[PDB]
Ligand binder design. Structure first.
Ligand SMILES: *[C@@H]1O[C@H](CO)[C@@H](O)[C@H](O)[C@H]1NC(C)=O
Ligand SMILES: *[C@@H]1O[C@H](CO)[C@@H](O)[C@H](O)[C@H]1NC(C)=O
Ligand SMILES: *[C@@H]1O[C@H](CO)[C@@H](O)[C@H](O)[C@H]1NC(C)=O
Ligand SMILES: *[C@@H]1O[C@H](CO)[C@@H](O)[C@H](O)[C@H]1NC(C)=O
Ligand SMILES: *[C@@H]1O[C@H](CO)[C@@H](O)[C@H](O)[C@H]1NC(C)=O
Length: 479
């Protein structure tokens, strides 16, 4: 069975309509199970759509709008699950399939095998030249309760096209009262297994056209075989060798390539508040999100953090590169249209736990007394250095304390904390405890005199170790 992903384009199309067609063929040709939506929009009159015969099932919605072809060749389409709906209303939407001043438009629907719409409504409207679809009993299909040709005599006034072989096959409204679902005839012995969607060829869960829920090796089951199965004799949950994950309406021993396991299911990526581990576990800290720093990938050409790039750092926990704050970044670039940074926007770094390169503070908003926006920064990697330095805090008159409360590791490079005239606490810090290697040293010069700090009461809390503090209070200790 061949699987593919849908589109989430709705009415949008490529301006070159031949390209809209090539995209359609590319996305859906040779695909049997659409994991998502089937959107056929803005397709011209003389186009070969016969490749749509590969499709047996759509999980999302089927959208057919603004097209101009005569026939819709979806003859193998058995089921629309309607997991996602068009405008959150329709599983099947067929409209405006005509072009003005040209007797070009949709004439008939090749949907003879379409007998199941699990969720959503049906919307068939304003198709100038569409015939027969008005004779269809959508009540049988949907599980939730101009001058045209005539249906063939045998079709009993319900058909998709004009011949004896275009009749609508009813699989629910023609059943015996006893049936849990669909049927293949009108007798009591003709009921399908309750797990059969579309209909069936016999009474077993292996005789279905499609599955109501999941398909476990040809059998239509309520749920996939679990990791542990109860044993009524031994009274224990025995390990199930047949255990399978859910991949849409399939039960799989192995998820497709690069997919993750979220609560027994195969997903493209972990949901919000969950993290990859390949399984999805709830987040230990703030969910991991690696970001490019100044001079890396997306920010290769960037020189400082500024108003035009600040937002690229929203929810980042790890910075791949550096974090650089220059005068042009803090105070704005008059030589361009780059205005000064909203100092409140620097709060965006409160999610950052790691910086792989260096932290270079050449400028800081003069009303910010500290670096508490970096309160959760655990590591400075120093994988790349600024003249041997991995931490540079230079010439800040506005700063009073550091307040890097989570800073536990400076993996490489030296420290340069200089000419910060009003800065205290720095002298209480035993930098050694943060350094990973012998060569790592500190340049400390012309900050507030340690004696004047003490006299003014800028001292570590009693709870702090001999290692010192980043600022005042008992939340600022090194150990
Ligand atoms: C429609 O469904 C039947 C039953 O699953 C299958 O045999 C057939 O290939 C599809 N039918 C047509 C008429 O294309
Ligand atoms: C279930 O999967 C089997 C593969 O073992 C496939 O051939 C068949 O079409 C599926 N059955 C239904 C009813 O979807
Ligand atoms: C950042 O994550 C929060 C939840 O932690 C979410 O509210 C927000 O929309 C995310 N911001 C962006 C720009 O994606
Ligand atoms: C710091 O000053 C700026 C303007 O220079 C303003 O955005 C900000 O709100 C101040 N921070 C406060 C009041 O917490
Ligand atoms: C500490 O305090 C004194 C006295 O008020 C002042 O001269 C200066 O800020 C400090 N001393 C030195 C040598 O910087």
């Amino acid at each position: 069975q061949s699987v593919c992903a849908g589109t989430e384009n709705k009415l949008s199309s490529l301006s070159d309509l031949e390209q809209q067609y090539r995209a359609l063929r590319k996305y859906y040709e040779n695909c049997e199970v659409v994991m998502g939506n089937l959107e056929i929009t803005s397709i011209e009159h003389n186009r070969d759509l016969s490749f749509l015969r590969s499709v047996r099932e759509v999980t999302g919605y089927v959208l057919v709008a603004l097209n101009q072809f005569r026939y819709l060749p979806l003859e193998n389409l058995r089921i629309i699950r309607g997991t996602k709906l068009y405008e959150d209303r329709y599983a099947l939407a067929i409209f405006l399939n005509y072009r003005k001043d040209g007797n070009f438009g949709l004439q008939e629907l090749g949907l003879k095998n379409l007998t199941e719409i699990l969720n959503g409504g049906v919307y068939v409207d304003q198709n100038k030249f569409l015939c027969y679809a008005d004779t269809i009993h959508w009540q049988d299909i949907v599980r939730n309760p101009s001058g045209c040709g005539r249906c063939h005599k045998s079709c009993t006034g319900r058909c998709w096209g004009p011949t004896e072989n275009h009749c609508q096959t009813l699989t629910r409204t023609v059943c015996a009262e006893q049936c849990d679902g669909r049927c293949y005839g009108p007798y009591v012995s003709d009921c399908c297994h309750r797990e059969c969607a579309g209909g069936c060829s016999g009474p077993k869960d292996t005789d279905c056209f499609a599955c109501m829920n999941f398909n476990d090796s040809g059998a239509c089951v309520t749920q996939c075989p679990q990791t542990f199965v109860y044993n009524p004799t031994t009274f224990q949950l025995e390990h199930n060798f047949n255990a399978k994950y859910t991949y849409g309406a399939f039960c799989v021993k192995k998820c497709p390539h690069n997919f993750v396991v979220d609560s027994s299911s195969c997903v493209r990526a972990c949901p919000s508040s969950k993290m990859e581990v390949k399984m999805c576990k709830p987040c230990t800290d703030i969910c991991p999100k690696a970001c490019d720093g100044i001079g890396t990938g997306s920010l290769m050409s960037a020189q400082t953090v500024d108003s035009s790039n600040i937002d690229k750092f929203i929810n980042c926990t790890k910075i791949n590169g550096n974090l650089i704050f220059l005068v042009t970044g803090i105070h704005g670039d008059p030589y361009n249209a780059i205005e000064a940074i909203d100092p409140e926007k620097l709060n965006v770094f409160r999610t950052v736990r790691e910086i792989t390169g260096f932290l270079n503070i050449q400028s800081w908003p003069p009303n910010m007394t500290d670096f508490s926006v970096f309160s959760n920064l655990v590591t400075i990697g120093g994988r790349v250095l600024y003249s041997g330095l991995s931490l540079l805090i230079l010439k800040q008159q506005g700063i009073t304390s550091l307040q890097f409360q989570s800073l536990k590791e400076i993996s490489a490079g030296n420290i340069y904390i200089t000419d910060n005239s009003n800065l205290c606490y720095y002298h209480t810090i035993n930098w050694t405890t943060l350094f990973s290697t012998i060569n790592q040293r500190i340049v400390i010069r012309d900050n507030r005199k340690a004696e004047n700090c003490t006299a003014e009461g800028m001292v570590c809390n009693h709870l702090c170790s001999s290692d010192g503090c980043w600022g005042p209070g008992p939340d600022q200790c090194l150990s």
